[PDB]
From a paper:
[name] is a [name] malaria transmission-blocking vaccine candidate that is anchored to the parasite surface through a C-terminal glycosylphosphatidylinositol (GPI) moiety, and plays a role in parasite survival in the mosquito midgut. [name] contains epidermal growth factor (EGF)-like domains and is part of a family of sexual stage malaria proteins that includes the related vaccine antigen Pfs25. [name] is a glycosylphosphatidylinositol-anchored protein expressed on the surface of zygotes and ookinetes and plays a similar role as Pfs25 in ookinete survival and traversal through the midgut. [name] is a GPI-anchored protein, consisting of an N-terminal signal sequence, four EGF-like domains, and a C-terminal hydrophobic sequence that is the site of GPI attachment.
The construct used for crystallography consisted of V1-S173, comprising only the four EGF-like domains. The crystal structure of [name] was solved to a resolution of 2.3 Å. The [name] structure is comprised of four EGF-like domains in a triangular arrangement, with sides of 40 Å and 50 Å and a thickness of ~ 20 Å, with the overall structure stabilized by 10 disulfide bridges. EGF domains 1–3 adopt the characteristic structure, consisting of a major two-stranded β-sheet followed by a loop and a shorter two-stranded β-sheet, while only a single two-stranded β-sheet in EGF4 was observed. EGF domains 1 and 4 each have two disulfide bridges, while EGF domains 2 and 3 contain three disulfide bridges. Due to flexibility and a lack of clear density at the C-terminus of the protein, the C-terminal portion of EGF4 (residues S157-S173) could not be modelled. The major difference between the structures of the two antigens lies in the lack of the third disulfide bridge in EGF4 of [name]. This is reflected in the greater degree of disorder present in EGF4 of [name] compared to Pfs25, such that its C-terminal region could not be resolved in the crystal structure. The residues shown to stabilize the triangular arrangement of the EGF domains in Pfs25 are conserved in [name]: Q14, M15, S16, H18, E20, K98, S112, C113, T131 and L135. However, the crystal packing of [name] did not adopt a similar tile-like pattern and we also saw no evidence of interaction between Pfs25 and [name] as measured by BLI.
Numbering used by the authors: -1 to 155
Amino acid sequence: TGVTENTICKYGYLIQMSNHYECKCIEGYVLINEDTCGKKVVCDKVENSFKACDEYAYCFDLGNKNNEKQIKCMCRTEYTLTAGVCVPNVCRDKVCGKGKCIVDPANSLTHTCSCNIGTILNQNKLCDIQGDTPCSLKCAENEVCTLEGNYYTCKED
């Protein structure tokens, strides 16, 4: 199973889309897993290899028959680039319309689309249908569900 209403996001907070929950990271952090974030690290040392450097990305160093550092921010294993951002392999060059491609929690072998609020998912797994999903987050004390762009999130009053 992926992110649910009771999922705890390490160094991140819960957001709600039309048909799924997701974890979004605190300032200065990026996603390692669906529910885990780590500090965004600058890839400028071999000592920093495999540290978080972007969403689903970690620092990677190449020894191209060299002694110099050849380091870049690379998609973690089981992830690949799509539209300039690392995505799950099941999301390789997949489109969602008004939504975000994710791993399908009901079947890890396929992808699905987490649709922006105001759009629901069509039977072809495209976010191109107009529907309004109510907010189902459990917000903390002195907090209220707030629509921030494409996703609901709990915000302070």
